[PDB]
Amino acid sequence: SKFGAISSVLNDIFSRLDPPEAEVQIDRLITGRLQSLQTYVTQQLIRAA
Amino acid sequence: FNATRFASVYAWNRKRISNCVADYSVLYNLAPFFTFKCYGVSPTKLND
Amino acid sequence: NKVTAQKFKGLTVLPPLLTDEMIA
Amino acid sequence: KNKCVNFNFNGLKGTGVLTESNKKFLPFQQFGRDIADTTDAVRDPQTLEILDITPCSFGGVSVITPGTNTSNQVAVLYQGVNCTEV
């Protein structure tokens, strides 16, 4: 999932954009993936209980 | 870029470029104040 | 018998400490 | 081929190992994706042949140790890998 970014591939962003706004795109991707992993960990904890 | 007569804005022209290597360095020999505004791709490294 | 996959993303399954033979 | 290299196929960058592929996707088909929607099969532009992309050998490493109060020898556990391949 692109999570609102222009592409869902890290290397594609790095090879297609310059650092100044590739930074923003990568920030969006990282925060989305981190949120998803946090959610998974939360349900795992609940099911463990 | 070096055509003698560009079409009117309302009846704008359309051209297809294919099956060729594109070198964008040449385009920097134009008039000194050409705006080169690019959306979605960094103009500096368009050659990769 | 009545009770019954390649993820390079970084998800692994750790084996349990107690094998089924010890439980049996 | 057959080693961990950084590759770039028509602007598609990546890092991994390129191996001979037994996949037989039709001539019109160019790329190859997987269940996770990642490009794992590719075709060389210069020569029309099929290559499989595999991530380089990675794994997890943990340390077995007694308390430092009594000793300082350690052992190494490589999780989920045959050690003839490390």
Coordinates of N, CA and C in Angstrom, one line a residue:
Chain A
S1 N 0.8 -1.2 0.0 CA 0.0 0.0 0.0 C 0.9 1.2 0.0
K2 N 0.5 2.2 -0.8 CA 1.3 3.4 -1.0 C 1.2 4.4 0.2
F3 N 0.2 4.3 1.0 CA -0.1 5.1 2.2 C 0.0 6.6 1.8
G4 N -0.5 7.0 0.7 CA -0.5 8.4 0.2 C 0.7 8.9 -0.4
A5 N 1.8 8.1 -0.5 CA 3.0 8.5 -1.2 C 2.8 8.3 -2.7
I6 N 3.8 8.8 -3.5 CA 3.7 8.7 -4.9 C 4.1 7.3 -5.4
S7 N 4.8 6.5 -4.6 CA 5.1 5.1 -4.9 C 5.4 4.4 -3.6
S8 N 5.2 3.0 -3.7 CA 5.3 2.2 -2.5 C 6.7 1.4 -2.5
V9 N 7.7 1.9 -3.2 CA 9.0 1.2 -3.3 C 10.0 2.2 -2.8
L10 N 10.9 1.8 -1.9 CA 11.9 2.7 -1.3 C 12.9 3.1 -2.4
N11 N 13.4 2.1 -3.1 CA 14.4 2.4 -4.2 C 13.9 3.3 -5.3
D12 N 12.6 3.0 -5.6 CA 11.9 3.9 -6.7 C 11.9 5.3 -6.2
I13 N 11.5 5.6 -5.0 CA 11.5 7.0 -4.5 C 12.9 7.6 -4.5
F14 N 13.9 6.8 -4.1 CA 15.3 7.3 -4.0 C 15.9 7.6 -5.3
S15 N 15.6 6.7 -6.3 CA 16.1 6.9 -7.7 C 15.2 7.9 -8.5
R16 N 14.0 8.2 -8.1 CA 13.2 9.1 -8.9 C 13.0 10.5 -8.3
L17 N 13.4 10.7 -7.0 CA 13.3 12.0 -6.4 C 14.6 12.4 -5.7
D18 N 14.8 13.7 -5.7 CA 16.0 14.2 -5.0 C 15.7 14.2 -3.5
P19 N 16.7 14.3 -2.6 CA 16.6 14.1 -1.2 C 15.6 15.1 -0.5
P20 N 15.5 16.3 -0.9 CA 14.7 17.3 -0.1 C 13.2 16.9 0.1
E21 N 12.6 16.3 -0.9 CA 11.2 15.8 -0.8 C 11.1 14.3 -0.8
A22 N 12.1 13.6 -1.3 CA 12.1 12.2 -1.0 C 12.2 11.9 0.5
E23 N 12.7 12.8 1.3 CA 12.7 12.7 2.7 C 11.3 12.7 3.2
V24 N 10.4 13.6 2.7 CA 9.0 13.6 3.2 C 8.3 12.3 2.7
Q25 N 8.5 11.9 1.5 CA 7.9 10.6 1.0 C 8.3 9.4 1.9
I26 N 9.6 9.3 2.2 CA 10.1 8.2 3.0 C 9.5 8.3 4.4
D27 N 9.4 9.6 4.9 CA 8.8 9.8 6.3 C 7.4 9.2 6.3
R28 N 6.6 9.5 5.3 CA 5.2 9.1 5.2 C 5.2 7.5 5.2
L29 N 6.0 6.9 4.4 CA 6.0 5.5 4.3 C 6.4 4.8 5.6
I30 N 7.5 5.4 6.2 CA 8.0 4.8 7.5 C 6.9 4.9 8.6
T31 N 6.3 6.1 8.7 CA 5.3 6.2 9.8 C 4.1 5.3 9.5
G32 N 3.7 5.1 8.3 CA 2.6 4.2 8.0 C 2.9 2.7 8.4
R33 N 4.1 2.3 8.0 CA 4.5 0.9 8.3 C 4.7 0.7 9.8
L34 N 5.2 1.7 10.5 CA 5.4 1.6 11.9 C 4.0 1.5 12.6
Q35 N 3.0 2.3 12.1 CA 1.7 2.2 12.7 C 1.1 0.8 12.5
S36 N 1.3 0.3 11.3 CA 0.7 -1.1 11.1 C 1.4 -2.1 12.0
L37 N 2.7 -2.0 12.2 CA 3.4 -3.0 13.0 C 3.0 -2.8 14.5
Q38 N 2.8 -1.6 14.9 CA 2.3 -1.3 16.3 C 0.9 -2.0 16.5
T39 N 0.0 -1.8 15.5 CA -1.3 -2.4 15.6 C -1.2 -3.9 15.7
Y40 N -0.4 -4.5 14.9 CA -0.2 -6.0 15.0 C 0.3 -6.4 16.3
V41 N 1.3 -5.7 16.9 CA 1.8 -6.1 18.2 C 0.7 -5.9 19.3
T42 N -0.2 -4.9 19.1 CA -1.2 -4.7 20.1 C -2.2 -5.9 20.1
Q43 N -2.7 -6.3 18.9 CA -3.6 -7.5 18.9 C -2.9 -8.7 19.4
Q44 N -1.6 -8.9 19.1 CA -0.9 -10.0 19.6 C -0.9 -10.1 21.1
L45 N -0.6 -8.9 21.7 CA -0.6 -8.9 23.2 C -2.0 -9.2 23.8
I46 N -3.1 -8.7 23.1 CA -4.4 -9.0 23.6 C -4.7 -10.5 23.5
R47 N -4.4 -11.1 22.4 CA -4.6 -12.5 22.2 C -3.8 -13.4 23.2
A48 N -2.6 -12.9 23.5 CA -1.7 -13.6 24.4 C -2.4 -13.6 25.8
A49 N -3.0 -12.4 26.2 CA -3.7 -12.4 27.5 C -4.8 -13.4 27.5
Chain B
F1 N 12.5 21.7 -30.4 CA 12.9 22.9 -29.7 C 13.3 24.0 -30.7
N2 N 13.9 23.6 -31.8 CA 14.4 24.6 -32.8 C 13.5 24.8 -34.0
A3 N 12.2 24.4 -33.8 CA 11.3 24.6 -34.9 C 11.1 26.1 -35.2
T4 N 10.8 26.5 -36.4 CA 10.6 27.9 -36.8 C 9.2 28.4 -36.4
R5 N 8.2 27.6 -36.3 CA 6.8 28.0 -36.1 C 6.2 27.0 -35.1
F6 N 5.9 27.5 -33.9 CA 5.1 26.7 -33.0 C 3.6 27.0 -33.2
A7 N 2.8 26.0 -33.0 CA 1.3 26.1 -33.2 C 0.7 27.0 -32.1
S8 N -0.5 27.5 -32.4 CA -1.2 28.3 -31.5 C -1.6 27.5 -30.3
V9 N -1.8 28.2 -29.1 CA -2.1 27.5 -27.9 C -3.4 26.7 -27.9
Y10 N -4.4 27.2 -28.6 CA -5.7 26.5 -28.7 C -5.6 25.3 -29.5
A11 N -4.9 25.4 -30.7 CA -4.6 24.2 -31.5 C -3.2 23.7 -31.3
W12 N -2.9 23.3 -30.0 CA -1.6 22.9 -29.7 C -1.2 21.6 -30.4
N13 N 0.1 21.4 -30.5 CA 0.6 20.2 -31.2 C 0.9 19.1 -30.3
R14 N 1.0 17.9 -30.9 CA 1.3 16.6 -30.1 C 2.3 15.8 -30.9
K15 N 3.3 15.4 -30.2 CA 4.4 14.6 -30.8 C 4.7 13.4 -29.9
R16 N 5.0 12.2 -30.5 CA 5.4 11.0 -29.8 C 6.9 10.7 -29.9
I17 N 7.6 10.5 -28.8 CA 9.0 10.2 -28.8 C 9.2 8.8 -28.3
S18 N 9.8 7.9 -29.2 CA 10.0 6.5 -28.8 C 11.1 5.9 -29.6
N19 N 11.6 4.8 -29.0 CA 12.7 4.0 -29.7 C 13.9 4.8 -29.9
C20 N 14.3 5.6 -28.9 CA 15.5 6.4 -29.0 C 16.1 6.7 -27.6
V21 N 17.4 6.9 -27.5 CA 18.0 7.4 -26.3 C 17.8 8.9 -26.2
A22 N 17.4 9.3 -25.0 CA 17.1 10.8 -24.7 C 18.2 11.4 -23.9
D23 N 18.9 12.4 -24.4 CA 19.9 13.1 -23.7 C 19.3 14.5 -23.4
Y24 N 19.1 14.8 -22.1 CA 18.6 16.1 -21.7 C 19.6 17.1 -21.4
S25 N 20.9 16.8 -21.5 CA 21.9 17.8 -21.4 C 21.8 18.9 -22.5
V26 N 21.5 18.5 -23.7 CA 21.5 19.5 -24.8 C 20.5 20.6 -24.5
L27 N 19.3 20.2 -23.9 CA 18.3 21.2 -23.5 C 18.8 22.3 -22.6
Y28 N 20.0 22.2 -22.1 CA 20.5 23.3 -21.3 C 21.2 24.4 -22.1
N29 N 21.3 24.2 -23.4 CA 21.9 25.3 -24.2 C 20.9 26.3 -24.8
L30 N 19.7 26.3 -24.2 CA 18.6 27.2 -24.6 C 18.9 28.6 -24.2
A31 N 17.8 29.5 -24.3 CA 17.9 30.8 -23.8 C 18.2 30.8 -22.3
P32 N 19.0 31.8 -21.8 CA 19.5 31.6 -20.4 C 18.4 31.6 -19.3
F33 N 17.2 32.0 -19.5 CA 16.2 32.1 -18.5 C 15.0 31.1 -18.8
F34 N 15.3 29.9 -19.2 CA 14.2 28.9 -19.5 C 13.8 28.3 -18.1
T35 N 12.5 28.4 -17.8 CA 12.0 27.7 -16.7 C 11.8 26.2 -17.0
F36 N 12.3 25.3 -16.1 CA 12.4 23.9 -16.2 C 11.7 23.2 -15.1
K37 N 10.4 23.5 -14.9 CA 9.7 23.1 -13.7 C 9.2 21.6 -14.0
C38 N 9.6 20.7 -13.1 CA 9.2 19.3 -13.2 C 8.4 18.9 -12.0
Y39 N 7.4 18.1 -12.3 CA 6.5 17.5 -11.3 C 6.6 16.0 -11.3
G40 N 6.9 15.4 -10.1 CA 7.1 14.0 -10.0 C 8.4 13.4 -10.1
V41 N 9.4 14.2 -10.8 CA 10.7 13.7 -11.0 C 11.7 14.9 -10.8
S42 N 12.8 14.6 -10.2 CA 13.8 15.6 -10.1 C 14.5 15.9 -11.4
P43 N 14.5 17.2 -11.9 CA 15.1 17.4 -13.2 C 16.6 17.1 -13.3
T44 N 17.3 17.3 -12.2 CA 18.7 17.1 -12.2 C 19.2 15.8 -12.7
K45 N 18.6 14.7 -12.2 CA 19.0 13.3 -12.5 C 18.0 12.6 -13.4
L46 N 17.4 13.3 -14.4 CA 16.5 12.7 -15.4 C 17.2 11.8 -16.3
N47 N 18.5 11.7 -16.3 CA 19.3 10.9 -17.2 C 19.5 9.5 -16.8
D48 N 19.0 9.1 -15.7 CA 19.2 7.7 -15.1 C 18.0 6.8 -15.2
Chain C
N1 N -3.8 -36.0 14.0 CA -4.1 -36.0 12.6 C -5.3 -35.1 12.2
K2 N -6.2 -34.9 13.1 CA -7.4 -34.0 12.8 C -7.0 -32.5 12.7
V3 N -5.9 -32.1 13.2 CA -5.5 -30.7 13.2 C -4.3 -30.5 12.4
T4 N -4.3 -29.5 11.5 CA -3.2 -29.2 10.6 C -2.3 -28.1 11.2
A5 N 4.1 -18.9 3.0 CA 4.8 -19.7 4.0 C 6.3 -19.4 4.1
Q6 N 6.8 -18.7 3.0 CA 8.2 -18.3 2.9 C 8.2 -16.7 2.9
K7 N 8.4 -16.2 4.1 CA 8.3 -14.7 4.3 C 9.8 -14.2 4.5
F8 N 10.3 -13.6 3.5 CA 11.6 -12.9 3.6 C 11.5 -11.5 4.3
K9 N 10.2 -11.1 4.6 CA 10.0 -9.7 5.1 C 10.7 -9.6 6.5
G10 N 10.9 -10.7 7.2 CA 11.5 -10.7 8.5 C 10.6 -11.3 9.6
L11 N 9.6 -12.0 9.2 CA 8.8 -12.7 10.2 C 9.2 -14.2 10.3
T12 N 9.5 -14.6 11.5 CA 10.0 -15.9 11.8 C 9.1 -16.6 12.9
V13 N 9.1 -17.9 12.9 CA 8.4 -18.7 13.9 C 9.4 -19.4 14.7
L14 N 9.4 -19.2 16.0 CA 10.3 -19.9 16.9 C 9.7 -21.2 17.4
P15 N 10.6 -22.2 17.5 CA 10.0 -23.5 17.9 C 9.7 -23.5 19.4
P16 N 8.8 -24.3 19.8 CA 8.5 -24.4 21.3 C 9.6 -25.1 22.0
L17 N 9.8 -24.8 23.3 CA 10.8 -25.5 24.1 C 10.4 -27.0 24.3
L18 N 9.2 -27.3 24.6 CA 8.7 -28.6 24.9 C 8.2 -29.3 23.6
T19 N 8.9 -30.3 23.2 CA 8.5 -31.1 22.0 C 7.3 -31.9 22.4
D20 N 6.6 -32.4 21.3 CA 5.4 -33.1 21.5 C 5.6 -34.5 22.2
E21 N 6.8 -35.0 22.0 CA 7.2 -36.3 22.7 C 7.2 -36.1 24.2
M22 N 7.8 -35.0 24.7 CA 7.8 -34.8 26.1 C 6.4 -34.6 26.7
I23 N 5.5 -33.9 25.9 CA 4.1 -33.7 26.4 C 3.4 -35.0 26.5
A24 N 3.7 -35.9 25.5 CA 3.1 -37.3 25.5 C 3.6 -38.0 26.7
Chain D
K1 N 26.3 -13.4 -11.8 CA 25.3 -14.3 -11.3 C 25.8 -15.0 -10.1
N2 N 24.9 -15.5 -9.3 CA 25.1 -16.4 -8.2 C 25.9 -15.7 -7.0
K3 N 25.7 -14.4 -6.8 CA 26.3 -13.8 -5.6 C 25.5 -12.5 -5.3
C4 N 25.8 -12.0 -4.1 CA 25.1 -10.8 -3.6 C 25.6 -9.6 -4.3
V5 N 24.8 -9.0 -5.2 CA 25.2 -7.9 -6.0 C 24.1 -6.9 -6.0
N6 N 24.5 -5.6 -6.1 CA 23.5 -4.5 -6.4 C 23.2 -4.4 -7.9
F7 N 22.0 -4.6 -8.3 CA 21.6 -4.6 -9.7 C 20.6 -3.5 -10.0
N8 N 20.6 -3.1 -11.3 CA 19.8 -2.0 -11.8 C 19.3 -2.4 -13.2
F9 N 18.1 -2.8 -13.3 CA 17.5 -3.2 -14.6 C 16.5 -2.1 -15.0
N10 N 16.8 -1.3 -16.0 CA 16.0 -0.3 -16.6 C 15.4 0.6 -15.5
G11 N 16.3 1.1 -14.7 CA 15.9 2.0 -13.6 C 15.3 1.3 -12.4
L12 N 15.1 0.0 -12.4 CA 14.6 -0.8 -11.3 C 15.9 -1.2 -10.5
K13 N 16.1 -0.6 -9.3 CA 17.2 -0.9 -8.5 C 16.9 -2.0 -7.5
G14 N 17.9 -2.7 -7.0 CA 17.7 -3.7 -6.0 C 19.1 -4.3 -5.6
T15 N 19.0 -5.1 -4.5 CA 20.2 -5.8 -4.0 C 19.8 -7.3 -3.8
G16 N 20.6 -8.2 -4.3 CA 20.2 -9.6 -4.1 C 21.1 -10.5 -5.0
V17 N 20.6 -11.7 -5.2 CA 21.3 -12.7 -5.9 C 20.5 -13.1 -7.1
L18 N 21.1 -13.1 -8.3 CA 20.4 -13.4 -9.6 C 20.8 -14.8 -10.0
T19 N 19.8 -15.7 -10.1 CA 20.0 -17.1 -10.5 C 19.2 -17.4 -11.7
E20 N 19.6 -18.5 -12.4 CA 18.8 -19.0 -13.5 C 17.4 -19.4 -13.0
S21 N 16.4 -19.1 -13.8 CA 15.0 -19.2 -13.5 C 14.4 -20.3 -14.4
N22 N 13.6 -21.2 -13.8 CA 12.9 -22.2 -14.5 C 11.4 -21.8 -14.8
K23 N 11.1 -20.5 -14.4 CA 9.8 -20.0 -14.7 C 9.6 -19.9 -16.2
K24 N 8.4 -20.0 -16.7 CA 8.1 -20.1 -18.1 C 7.0 -19.1 -18.6
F25 N 7.0 -17.9 -17.9 CA 6.0 -16.9 -18.3 C 6.1 -16.5 -19.7
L26 N 4.9 -16.3 -20.3 CA 4.8 -16.1 -21.8 C 5.7 -15.0 -22.3
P27 N 6.0 -15.0 -23.6 CA 6.9 -13.9 -24.1 C 6.4 -12.5 -23.9
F28 N 5.1 -12.2 -24.0 CA 4.7 -10.9 -23.8 C 4.9 -10.4 -22.3
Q29 N 4.8 -11.3 -21.4 CA 5.0 -10.9 -20.0 C 6.5 -10.6 -19.8
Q30 N 6.7 -9.5 -19.0 CA 8.1 -9.0 -18.8 C 8.6 -9.2 -17.4
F31 N 7.8 -8.7 -16.4 CA 8.3 -8.8 -15.0 C 7.6 -10.0 -14.3
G32 N 8.0 -10.2 -13.1 CA 7.4 -11.3 -12.3 C 7.3 -10.9 -10.8
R33 N 6.1 -10.9 -10.3 CA 5.9 -10.5 -8.9 C 5.5 -11.8 -8.1
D34 N 5.2 -11.6 -6.8 CA 5.0 -12.7 -5.9 C 3.7 -12.5 -5.1
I35 N 3.5 -13.3 -4.1 CA 2.4 -13.2 -3.2 C 2.4 -11.9 -2.4
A36 N 3.6 -11.5 -2.0 CA 3.8 -10.2 -1.3 C 3.8 -9.0 -2.2
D37 N 3.6 -9.2 -3.5 CA 3.7 -8.1 -4.5 C 5.0 -7.4 -4.6
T38 N 6.1 -8.3 -4.7 CA 7.4 -7.8 -4.9 C 8.1 -8.5 -6.1
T39 N 8.8 -7.7 -6.9 CA 9.4 -8.3 -8.1 C 10.5 -9.3 -7.8
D40 N 10.2 -10.5 -8.0 CA 11.2 -11.6 -7.8 C 11.7 -12.2 -9.1
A41 N 11.1 -12.0 -10.2 CA 11.5 -12.5 -11.5 C 11.6 -11.4 -12.5
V42 N 12.7 -11.4 -13.3 CA 13.0 -10.3 -14.2 C 13.5 -10.9 -15.5
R43 N 13.6 -10.1 -16.6 CA 14.1 -10.5 -17.9 C 15.1 -9.5 -18.3
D44 N 16.3 -9.9 -18.8 CA 17.3 -9.0 -19.1 C 17.0 -8.3 -20.4
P45 N 17.2 -7.0 -20.5 CA 16.9 -6.3 -21.7 C 17.8 -6.6 -22.9
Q46 N 19.1 -6.8 -22.6 CA 20.0 -7.1 -23.7 C 19.7 -8.5 -24.3
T47 N 19.6 -9.5 -23.5 CA 19.3 -10.9 -23.9 C 18.0 -11.4 -23.2
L48 N 17.1 -11.8 -24.0 CA 15.8 -12.2 -23.5 C 15.9 -13.5 -22.8
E49 N 16.2 -13.5 -21.5 CA 16.3 -14.6 -20.6 C 15.8 -14.3 -19.2
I50 N 15.4 -15.3 -18.5 CA 14.7 -15.2 -17.2 C 15.7 -15.3 -16.1
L51 N 15.6 -14.4 -15.1 CA 16.4 -14.4 -13.9 C 15.5 -14.3 -12.7
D52 N 15.9 -15.1 -11.6 CA 15.2 -15.1 -10.4 C 16.0 -14.3 -9.4
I53 N 15.4 -13.4 -8.6 CA 16.0 -12.6 -7.6 C 15.7 -13.1 -6.2
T54 N 16.8 -13.4 -5.5 CA 16.6 -13.9 -4.1 C 17.4 -13.0 -3.2
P55 N 16.8 -12.6 -2.0 CA 17.5 -11.7 -1.1 C 18.7 -12.4 -0.5
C56 N 19.8 -11.7 -0.2 CA 21.0 -12.2 0.3 C 20.8 -12.8 1.6
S57 N 21.6 -13.8 2.0 CA 21.5 -14.6 3.2 C 21.5 -13.7 4.4
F58 N 20.4 -13.6 5.1 CA 20.3 -12.9 6.3 C 19.8 -13.8 7.4
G59 N 19.9 -13.4 8.7 CA 19.4 -14.2 9.8 C 19.6 -13.5 11.1
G60 N 19.1 -14.1 12.1 CA 19.2 -13.6 13.5 C 20.2 -14.3 14.3
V61 N 20.9 -13.6 15.1 CA 22.0 -14.1 16.0 C 21.8 -13.7 17.4
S62 N 21.9 -14.6 18.3 CA 21.7 -14.4 19.7 C 22.9 -15.0 20.5
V63 N 23.0 -14.6 21.7 CA 24.2 -15.0 22.6 C 23.7 -15.7 23.8
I64 N 24.2 -16.9 24.1 CA 24.0 -17.6 25.3 C 25.2 -17.3 26.2
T65 N 24.8 -16.9 27.5 CA 25.9 -16.5 28.4 C 25.5 -16.7 29.8
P66 N 26.4 -17.2 30.7 CA 26.2 -17.1 32.1 C 26.4 -15.7 32.6
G67 N 26.1 -15.5 33.8 CA 26.2 -14.1 34.4 C 27.7 -13.7 34.4
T68 N 27.9 -12.4 34.1 CA 29.2 -11.9 34.1 C 29.9 -11.9 35.5
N69 N 29.1 -12.0 36.5 CA 29.6 -12.1 37.9 C 30.5 -13.4 38.1
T70 N 30.1 -14.5 37.4 CA 30.8 -15.7 37.6 C 31.8 -16.1 36.5
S71 N 31.5 -15.7 35.2 CA 32.4 -16.0 34.1 C 32.0 -15.0 33.0
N72 N 32.8 -15.1 31.9 CA 32.6 -14.3 30.7 C 32.7 -15.0 29.4
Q73 N 32.6 -16.4 29.4 CA 32.5 -17.1 28.2 C 31.1 -17.1 27.6
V74 N 31.0 -17.1 26.3 CA 29.7 -16.9 25.6 C 29.6 -18.0 24.5
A75 N 28.4 -18.3 24.0 CA 28.1 -19.1 22.9 C 27.2 -18.3 22.0
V76 N 27.2 -18.7 20.7 CA 26.5 -18.0 19.6 C 25.4 -19.0 19.0
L77 N 24.2 -18.5 19.0 CA 23.1 -19.3 18.3 C 22.6 -18.5 17.1
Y78 N 22.7 -19.2 16.0 CA 22.2 -18.6 14.7 C 20.8 -19.2 14.4
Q79 N 19.8 -18.3 14.6 CA 18.4 -18.8 14.6 C 18.0 -19.3 13.2
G80 N 17.5 -20.5 13.1 CA 16.8 -21.0 11.9 C 17.7 -21.0 10.7
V81 N 18.9 -21.5 10.8 CA 19.8 -21.6 9.7 C 20.8 -22.8 9.9
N82 N 21.0 -23.6 8.9 CA 22.1 -24.6 8.9 C 23.4 -23.8 8.9
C83 N 24.3 -24.2 9.8 CA 25.6 -23.5 9.9 C 26.6 -23.9 8.9
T84 N 26.3 -24.9 8.1 CA 27.2 -25.1 6.9 C 27.0 -24.0 5.8
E85 N 26.1 -23.1 6.1 CA 25.8 -22.0 5.1 C 26.1 -20.6 5.7
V86 N 27.0 -20.5 6.7 CA 27.3 -19.2 7.3 C 28.8 -18.9 7.1

